[PDB]
Structures are given as structure tokens and as C-alpha cells.
Amino acid sequence: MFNNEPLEQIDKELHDILADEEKRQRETINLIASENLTNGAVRECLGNRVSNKYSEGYPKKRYYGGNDFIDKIEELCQKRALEAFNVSDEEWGVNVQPLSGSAANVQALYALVGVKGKIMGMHLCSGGHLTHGFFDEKKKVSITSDMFESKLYKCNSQGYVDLDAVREMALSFKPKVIICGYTSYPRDIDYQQFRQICDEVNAYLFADISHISSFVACNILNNPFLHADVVTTTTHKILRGPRSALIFFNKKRNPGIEQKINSAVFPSFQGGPHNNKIAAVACQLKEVHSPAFKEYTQQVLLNSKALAKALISKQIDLVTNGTDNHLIVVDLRKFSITGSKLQETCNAINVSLNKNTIPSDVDCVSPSGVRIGTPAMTTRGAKEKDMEFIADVLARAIKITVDLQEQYGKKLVDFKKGLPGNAQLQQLKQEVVTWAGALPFP
Amino acid sequence: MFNNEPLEQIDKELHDILADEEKRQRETINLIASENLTNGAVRECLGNRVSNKYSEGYPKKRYYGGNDFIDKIEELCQKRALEAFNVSDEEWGVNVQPLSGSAANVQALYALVGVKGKIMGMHLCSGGHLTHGFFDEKKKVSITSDMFESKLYKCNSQGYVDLDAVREMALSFKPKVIICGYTSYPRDIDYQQFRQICDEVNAYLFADISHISSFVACNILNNPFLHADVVTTTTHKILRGPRSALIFFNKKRNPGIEQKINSAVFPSFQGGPHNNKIAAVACQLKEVHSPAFKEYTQQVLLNSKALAKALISKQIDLVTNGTDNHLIVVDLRKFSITGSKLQETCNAINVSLNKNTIPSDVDCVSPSGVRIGTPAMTTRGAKEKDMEFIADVLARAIKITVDLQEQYGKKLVDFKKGLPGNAQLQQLKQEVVTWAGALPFP
Numbered sequence: 001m002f003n004n005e006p007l008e009q010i011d012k013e014l015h016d017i018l019a020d021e022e023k024r025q026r027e028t029i030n031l032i033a034s035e036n037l038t039n040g041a042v043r044e045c046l047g048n049r050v051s052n053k054y055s056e057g058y059p060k061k062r063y064y065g066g067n068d069f070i071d072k073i074e075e076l077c078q079k080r081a082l083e084a085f086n087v088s089d090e091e092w093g094v095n096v097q098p099l100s101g102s103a104a105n106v107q108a109l110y111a112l113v114g115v116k117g118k119i120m121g122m123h124l125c126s127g128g129h130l131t132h133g134f135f136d137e138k139k140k141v142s143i144t145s146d147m148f149e150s151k152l153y154k155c156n157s158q159g160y161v162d163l164d165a166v167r168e169m170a171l172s173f174k175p176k177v178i179i180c181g182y183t184s185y186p187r188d189i190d191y192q193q194f195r196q197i198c199d200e201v202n203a204y205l206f207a208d209i210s211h212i213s214s215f216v217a218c219n220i221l222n223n224p225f226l227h228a229d230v231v232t233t234t235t236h237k238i239l240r241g242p243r244s245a246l247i248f249f250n251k252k253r254n255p256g257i258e259q260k261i262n263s264a265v266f267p268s269f270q271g272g273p274h275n276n277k278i279a280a281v282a283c284q285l286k287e288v289h290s291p292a293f294k295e296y297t298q299q300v301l302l303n304s305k306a307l308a309k310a311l312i313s314k315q316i317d318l319v320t321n322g323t324d325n326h327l328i329v330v331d332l333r334k335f336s337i338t339g340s341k342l343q344e345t346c347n348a349i350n351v352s353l354n355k356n357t358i359p360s361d362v363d364c365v366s367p368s369g370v371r372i373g374t375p376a377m378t379t380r381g382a383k384e385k386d387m388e389f390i391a392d393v394l395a396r397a398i399k400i401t402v403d404l405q406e407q408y409g410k411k412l413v414d415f416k417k418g419l420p421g422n423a424q425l426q427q428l429k430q431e432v433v434t435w436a437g438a439l440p441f442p
Numbered sequence: 443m444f445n446n447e448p449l450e451q452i453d454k455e456l457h458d459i460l461a462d463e464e465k466r467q468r469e470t471i472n473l474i475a476s477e478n479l480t481n482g483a484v485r486e487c488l489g490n491r492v493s494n495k496y497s498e499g500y501p502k503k504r505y506y507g508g509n510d511f512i513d514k515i516e517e518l519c520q521k522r523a524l525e526a527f528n529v530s531d532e533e534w535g536v537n538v539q540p541l542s543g544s545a546a547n548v549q550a551l552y553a554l555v556g557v558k559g560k561i562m563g564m565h566l567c568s569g570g571h572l573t574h575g576f577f578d579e580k581k582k583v584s585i586t587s588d589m590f591e592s593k594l595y596k597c598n599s600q601g602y603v604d605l606d607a608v609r610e611m612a613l614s615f616k617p618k619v620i621i622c623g624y625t626s627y628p629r630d631i632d633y634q635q636f637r638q639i640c641d642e643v644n645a646y647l648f649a650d651i652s653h654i655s656s657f658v659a660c661n662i663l664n665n666p667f668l669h670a671d672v673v674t675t676t677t678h679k680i681l682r683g684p685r686s687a688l689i690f691f692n693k694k695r696n697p698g699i700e701q702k703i704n705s706a707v708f709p710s711f712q713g714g715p716h717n718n719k720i721a722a723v724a725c726q727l728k729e730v731h732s733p734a735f736k737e738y739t740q741q742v743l744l745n746s747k748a749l750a751k752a753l754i755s756k757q758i759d760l761v762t763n764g765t766d767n768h769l770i771v772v773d774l775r776k777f778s779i780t781g782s783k784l785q786e787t788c789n790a791i792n793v794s795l796n797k798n799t800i801p802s803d804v805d806c807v808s809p810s811g812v813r814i815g816t817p818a819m820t821t822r823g824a825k826e827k828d829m830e831f832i833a834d835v836l837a838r839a840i841k842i843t844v845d846l847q848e849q850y851g852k853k854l855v856d857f858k859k860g861l862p863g864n865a866q867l868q869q870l871k872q873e874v875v876t877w878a879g880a881l882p883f884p
């Protein structure tokens with residue numbers, strides 16, 4: 001009693017929007033630092049009938065039966081996660097059930113501290129994620145500021161984590177958890193100095209490496225596994241897997257954390273795991289460990305470095321004046337334009353990036369920068385020499401944004417009126433589509 | 443810089459297990475009441491590259507750009523959902539971002555009541571879900587019992603919701619929310635009487651129709667939309683969509699609930715939506731609204747009715763002595779066996795079902811029943827005449843379980859030793875595999 005007609009036949013409306021989405025992805029210079037492109041195998045997993053199975057619980061301790069093949073999949077994903085990050089299954093455990101990064105963090109935080117528990121994270125404007133306790137004066141924006149008591153440490157004016165500030169805050173606030181690893185931080189992290197501060201105040205060290213996971217696995221950036229109690233990461237960014245998350249916990253430093261984290265994921269928070277996600281993660285984790293993937297990750301940093309260099313050579317200011325990782329934040333103050341304006345300009349030429357706060361920014365509406373990243377285009381074959389072109393297109397968008405603000409005004413409503421039909425933009429879009437459309441596309 | 447080799451080539455280890463899972467699904471009488479089989483279309487969506495896009499926020503109010511085709515998918519999904527449950531976009535809104543049922547419930551409850559907020563739901567042992575505030579003496583098992591102040595109302599000895607008890611509890615506890623719609627409740631619900639209790643104490647009416655959604659959409663069972671403030675449902679059970687969830691909210695009854703629910707899903711709880719889920723949901727929701735899908739849903743009930751009947755005629759007791767829906771809970775006390783034992787027996791003959799508490803059960807370990815449901819086999823083409831066969835097999839399993847308990851003992855450890863190699867089970871497995879293996883399989 002089912003219709004087995006293909007997607008194109010059964011739902012033509014939806015199939016066209018998705019064909020379009022596909023065409024837009026193919027013809028874009030994607031610099032969203034948090035995005036990547038999945039290969040066909042990861043998408044086969046995601047489309048696999050294994051998502052039919054309810055398998056609440058954990059492997060060999062399942063509530064239901066018929067989970068023999070599911071257990072094999074889940075255990076393989078756990079094995080390969082521990083492998084990929086070069087930790088021993090005797091010292092480290094991992095939970096592969098969190099449905100996405102925000103869930104993984106709320107779950108992992110609750111395991112450690114509980115309701116009304118105290119946590120410290122980096123402020124949103126400085127590079128922290130919403131799930132690191134974000135709130136504003138007007139409201140508790142994140143559940144992690146409401147279901148927990150949260151405190152937020154800022155970076156200095158130059159855009160670096162100020163560890164003096166982190167200690168001053170940890171001693172007076174006395175949190176049970178200190179979170180590090182970030183959404184828009186362009187530099188590496190001193191986990192040892194975090195570990196040192198946590199040890200002092202008897203807090204857990206929590207490292208969210210979602211943005212830089214590949215660097216950590218491939219031994220290119222600092223390893224928080226040598227110091228952290230918990231490591232969280234999404235699997236869909238630089239790691240290039242499906243949309244899912246992994247919670248890692250150090251058993252030796254905190255015995256009985258396994259039970260706390262596993263029970264927090266289920267049954268505290270989630271219900272049935274999504275086994276298609278688990279399959280897809282397991283698949284990408286095989287690839288993560290190959291020496292080929294280390295090469296891709298190396299190319300990511302080589303590209304980021306060269307993009308940063310080319311932008312500085314065009315008199316564009318970056319926060320921290322560069323990058324240790326896949327990401328760069330442009331400081332646009334010298335050009336007297338917002339990140340929101342540049343974003344719109346860039347979307348009009350099929351350049352995908354996001355607006356982003358800088359240190360001097362008081363508020364998150366009208367931020368003074370954009371964030372760019374190399375994982376997506378590095379996945380599409382672009383190399384160091386190709387970054388001069390991306391730098392050139394971004395320079396041209398900035399210039400056009402300045403001209404348009406002059407002609408149509410500073411109000412965003414007015415500015416946007418300038419965008420459609422603009423001869424130069426139409427021209428620049430053409431240049432972008434021609435270069436992007438011909439690149440390899442998984 | 444990617445490997446585009448197919449799944450079978452890139453990851454043979456994993457591809458074999460998934461081949462095995464496929465064959466296990468194919469060769470099973472699936473009576474897990476919460477399970478179903480997705481078609482190829484829905485799985486195409488889940489495999490679609492649309493999961494590459496970060497698209498935090500809501501349509502036309504997105505934080506990032508390049509979400510033109512994503513906006514269309516999300517708005518199509520919301521439209522198709524409102525249609526499917528026969529509600530006007532003027533009166534009702536829906537959020538299509540919740541990643542699964544548990545997440546949708548925590549998010550919706552948070553929107554309505556907030557941290558420390560008061561909620562009432564049905565106890566797990568009576569048919570309630572974990573996310574309806576479940577706790578026991580030892581611990582607060584669900585986050586819903588910890589981040590909220592929860593109280594639990596029970597069914598009477600015959601297994602029915604006792605509204606007298608729901609009233610008495612509501613007037614002394616005075617919750618902000620009362621939850622109805624359940625995980626193992628085999629009868630329909632008097633939402634009106636819930637609405638009149640809620641109104642009396644000024645609580646919201648929350649209906650979680652995950653198990654019975656298709657019945658609600660096709661007008662076969664009571665419609666909580668006529669009375670409820672919030673309706674939650676998973677999309678993966680009787681509705682036969684992907685793993686995801688929908689939050690419906692009545693704007694007329696509660697102006698400003700829209701913003702409350704929308705900000706609860708993001709940015710309070712989740713981050714980037716999973717657009718492959720959203721597409722997949724959109725795809726299934728079109729099918730849901732066809733008259734062919736109403737015929738399927740009717741067949742679910744016709745089969746459930748026939749299965750109930752056939753089990754009664756073999757002297758097997760059902761909680762409430764029957765069913766108004768897709769599910770039956772067998773009371774096994776007369777045979778002096780546990781649902782835990784029967785489940786293992788059924789798992790050995792490729793019969794998938796789950797252990798389940800009955801009203802007399804004190805504690806959730808060692809429950810005295812099993813739950814069975816018809817949506818999966820109804821999807822696989824089975825009709826009323828086929829239910830006698832399923833009833834025969836389950837009767838034979840109960841018998842075998844009694845005999846094995848006699849021979850090897852009441853302890854589950856010993857009991858399981860009796861399963862492997864058992865000539866009768868092998869015979870019965872064979873009969874199961876032959877009938878199931880040849881049924882239509884999406």
C-alpha cells in the first residue's frame with residue numbers, strides 16, 4: 001500500500017526547487033565557514049532504510065530487539081570516531097546519538113552541571129556559539145543561559161581570548177564548566193592554559209571543536225584531547241560528514257562520566273536515534289582517518305592562509321591580522337559599511353558569506369564584519385592561486401557596497417534597492433558563476 | 443578533492459551491515475507500533491544535497507543569505523502540514539524545524555511554561571511518553587521532569603484515562619500545561635474534557651498525536667485541533683515520513699504564541715535546520731493529503747481491529763479489551779510470563795514487538811505486556827485476513843515462552859539460554875520469513 005514512483009514523478013514541485021538549490025550550490029563561491037559538500041556515499045547513508053528502525057538505548061543494552069545490525073553500525077561509528085581523533089577506547093568514550101551540535105552541547109552541559117548549574121563560555125560577539133551560554137541584557141537568547149546560570153568572557157580589542165580575563169571570571173564566578181572552542185575564532189586555542197584555570201577552580205574543561213575538528217584529528221592544530229574532560233563536535237563542517245554530532249568524554253580524568261553523558265543524551269533529552277545519521281557519520285569517519293583527508297585539511301589551511309594574505313595585500317583589515325585555521329573575519333570599519341550590507345552585495349553575485357560581529361561591536365544587529373572560510377571551496381578543488389581571485393571578487397564587492405551606500409543611503413532598506421539589475425554586479429555574478437560552475441562538485 | 447566512489451566501494455564494511463539490515467527488515471513481521479517504511483521519494487529527499495545549507499532563522503527572516511530555494515522548501519512544508527491537518531494558516535501556525543519528537547516536545551513545553559514551569563502528563567506506565575514529564579523515585583529520568591516541575595496522572599485499573607483524576611490533580615497542582623496524546627494508549631482521547639479541565643485551571647492544552655497523527659489528518663479519530671493550544675507530532679510513525687517533528691500552535695487562542703514557539707526552536711534550543719528532513723517531510727505531507735493515504739490509514743485500523751479480535755478469540759487478554767487505533771497492548775499475566783521474555787522469543791522468530799507496562803505494573807523493569815501495532819505490516823500489503831496469521835504466530839510464541847520458562851526458569855538470563863537451536867522457534871522463524879520476505883517492500 002505504498003507509492004514507489006521516483007521523487008521527480010511523485011513530487012514535481014519539490015523536485016524543481018531541489019534541482020534549483022543544486023544549481024545554486026554548483027554556481028556559488030561558498031565561503032560560509034561552517035559549510036561543506038557531502039560526497040555520494042554519505043548521502044547514500046542518509047537515504048538508507050536503516051532510518052526505519054527504532055533503537056532507543058545503546059548497543060547491547062537496547063530496549064527493543066531486532067537491533068543486531070543497528071548495534072554493529074553504532075559500534076563501528078564509535079570505534080571510528082575514537083580512531084579518527086587518535087584516542088584510546090580505554091581512556092576515552094564517545095556518544096554518537098546527538099542529532100546536531102546544539103543538542104550535543106545542551107546534553108553534554110546538562111550531564112556535567114545539571115539544571116541551575118554554572119557555566120562559562122565565550123561571548124557571541126567575541127566568537128562564542130549560542131550554546132556556550134549566550135544571553136543579552138534583554139533576554140536569555142539560548143537555553144544554555146536559562147536552564148544554566150551563565151557567565152560570558154570576552155576577547156580583547158585585538159580579538160584574542162584574554163586568559164587573564166578568563167581566570168578573573170572563573171575565580172569570582174566559580175563555574176562547574178568552562179567552555180572553549182568557537183564559532184568565529186580565527187586563531188588556535190591554548191587548552192593547557194584553559195586546563196590550568198579549570199584545575200584551579202575545580203571546573204570541567206569543555207572543548208567544542210566543531211569548526212576545527214579536522215585540524216585536531218589530523219594533528220595540524222592543538223589537541224584538546226590532551227587536556228579536556230569533554231570534547232564536542234559537529235560532523236557537518238570541516239569534517240565533511242552529515243548533520244550530526246559526537247560527544248567525547250575522558251573516562252580516566254572523571255570515572256562515571258560515561259553514564260552521566262550517555263543518560264543525558266537518552267533518556268534525559270532524545271528518543272530514538274537517527275540511524276541514517278549514524279551510518280553517514282561512520283562512513284565519513286573512515287575517510288577522516290585516511291592520509292588523503294589530511295591532505296584536504298592541509299589544503300584548507302594553505303588556502304585560508306593565502307586568502308588572508310591576498311586580502312591584506314588589498315588593504316583589507318582582518319581581526320587578529322590573519323588566521324591559524326580555516327576562517328577569517330574581515331573588519332569593515334575603515335570602509336564605513338556594515339557586514340549586513342556586504343552580505344547582501346555578496347549574495348547578489350552568488351558569493352555566500354555571513355555577517356559577523358567584531359570586538360568593538362556592542363550589539364549583534366549591524367555587525368561590523370563578515371566571516372569567510374575555505375572548507376567548501378577547498379572541497380571543490382580550488383588551490384592557493386585561486387584565492388587571489390576570491391580576494392579580488394570580495395574587494396570588488398566591498399567597493400560596490402561603498403558606492404551603493406553613497407548612492408542609495410545607509411539604511412539597509414534603501415541600500416538593497418540599489419542591488420537588483422546593477423550592471424557591475426550582473427557582470428561580477430557572471431564571473432563568479434563561470435569559475436564556480438566549472439569546479440568539481442560532489 | 444573528494445572521493446566520489448559509491449557506498450559499496452568506499453565503505454564495504456558498512457555497506458554489508460546495511461545490506462543485512464535491509465534483509466532483516468524484509469524478512470520480519472514488524473509489529474513495533476511506532477515504526478513504518480519510508481518510500482524511495484522520501485529517502486531521495488533525505489539523501490539530497492539540500493542538507494549542505496546552513497539556514498538558521500526562519501524563511502524571509504534568515505540570518506544568512508542564499509536561502510532562496512531553502513525558503514521555498516520550508517514554506518512549502520509548513521503549508522502542506524497545515525493542509526494535511528485541515529487547519530487554516532490564519533488560525534494555526536506550524537514549525538517544521540524540530541529534529542525529532544522529543545526535541546519538539548521539550549521546545550514546545552519550554553515556549554509555554556519556561557524553566558521551572560509546571561506541567562502535567564500521563565505517567566509512562568499508563569501509556570505516556572518520557573517527554574511528558576517522566577520521573578520515578580530514584581531519579582528525574584526525563585529532562586521534562588527536571589527542567590520543569592512535573593506531575594503525572596495515571597490510568598485506572600482497566601487502562602483508561604481517568605479524567606476525574608486529571609481534574610483532582612490539575613486543581614491542587616495547578617499546572618500551566620496538561621499534555622495528552624500518548625505512546626502506548628490503545629483508545630481515542632476526549633480532548634474536549636481535557637479542554638474543559640485546562641480552561642478551569644487556566645492551563646494550555648497540549649496534544650502529542652505522534653502515534654495517531656494519520657488518524658487525525660484523515661478524520662478517523664478525534665481531532666485535537668478543535669480544542670488544543672499546541673499539537674506536536676513526529677513525522678516517522680503512522681504518518682510514514684522521515685525522522686522529524688512538527689509543532690502546531692493555535693494563534694487565535696494565544697496571540698504571541700507563534701513568536702514564543704518559533705524562538706524556543708531557534709535560537710533557544712537548535713541551531714541550523716536539517717533541510718533534507720524538511721524536504722522529506724514536505725514530500726510525505728503531499729502523500730498524506732491524498733485519498734489513497736486515507737485508504738492506507740483505514741486499512742491500519744481495519745487490521746488493528748481484526749488483530750485485536752483474532753487475539754481475543756485465542757483467549758489472549760488486551761488492555762481495555764480492544765483498540766480504537768493502530769495499537770494493542772497484550773496483558774500477559776494469565777500466562778505468568780513477562781513482556782521481556784516474549785519479546786526475546788519474538789525476536790528469535792523475526793517478530794518485532796516491544797515489552798510494555800500494564801496498569802497493574804508497579805515498576806518499568808519486568809513489565810507484564812507487549813505492544814503491537816499495524817502500520818508497518820499494513821504498509822507491506824497485509825489485510826484483515828492476514829491478521830489471523832499474525833495472531834497464530836504470537837499465540838505460538840506465547841506458548842513457546844511458557845514452555846521455555848518451565849524448562850529453563852523465571853530468570854531472564856537462564857530463559858534466553860533456551861532460545862538458540864530450539865526446533866520449534868526455527869520452524870516458526872521459517873514460516874515468518876517465508877510470508878514476510880515475499881510481501882511488498884518500499
Ligand SMILES: Cc1[nH]nc2c1[C@]1(C(C#N)=C(N)O2)c2cc(N3CCC(CC(=O)O)CC3)cc(F)c2CC1(C)C
Nearest residue numbers: 124127128129130141183184354355356357364498505
Ligand atoms: C546564530 C549563531 N549561533 N552561534 C553563532 C551565531 C552567529 C555568530 C556571530 N556573529 C556567532 N559567533 O556564533 C550569529 C548570531 C547572530 N545573532 C544576533 C543576535 C540574536 C539574538 C536575537 O535577537 O534573538 C542571536 C543570533 C547573528 C549572526 F549574523 C550570526 C552569525 C553567526 C551564525 C556566525
Ligand SMILES: Cc1[nH]nc2c1[C@]1(C(C#N)=C(N)O2)c2cc(N3CCC(CC(=O)O)CC3)cc(F)c2CC1(C)C
Nearest residue numbers: 056063566569570571572583625626796797798799806
Ligand atoms: C523508551 C520510551 N520512551 N517513551 C516511552 C518508552 C516506552 C514506554 C513504555 N512502556 C512508553 N510508554 O513510552 C518504554 C520505556 C522504558 N523505560 C524503562 C525505565 C526507564 C528509566 C530508567 O531506568 O532510566 C525509562 C524508559 C522501557 C520500555 F521497554 C519502554 C517501551 C516504550 C519504548 C514504548
Ligand SMILES: Cc1ncc(COP(=O)(O)O)c(CNCC(=O)O)c1O
Nearest residue numbers: 034100101102129182183210713714
Ligand atoms: C562552535 C559551534 N558549536 C556548535 C554549533 C552547532 O551546530 P548545529 O547548528 O548543528 O546545532 C556551531 C554552528 N554554528 C553556526 C555557524 O557557524 O554557521 C558552532 O560553530
Ligand SMILES: Cc1ncc(COP(=O)(O)O)c(CNCC(=O)O)c1O
Nearest residue numbers: 271272476542543544571624625652
Ligand atoms: C507520543 C510520543 N511522542 C514523542 C515521541 C518521540 O519521538 P522521537 O523518538 O522522534 O524523539 C514518541 C516515540 N516513542 C517511542 C515509541 O513509541 O516506540 C511518542 O510515542
Ligand SMILES: [Cl-]
Nearest residue numbers: 277488718719
Ligand atoms: Cl537526516
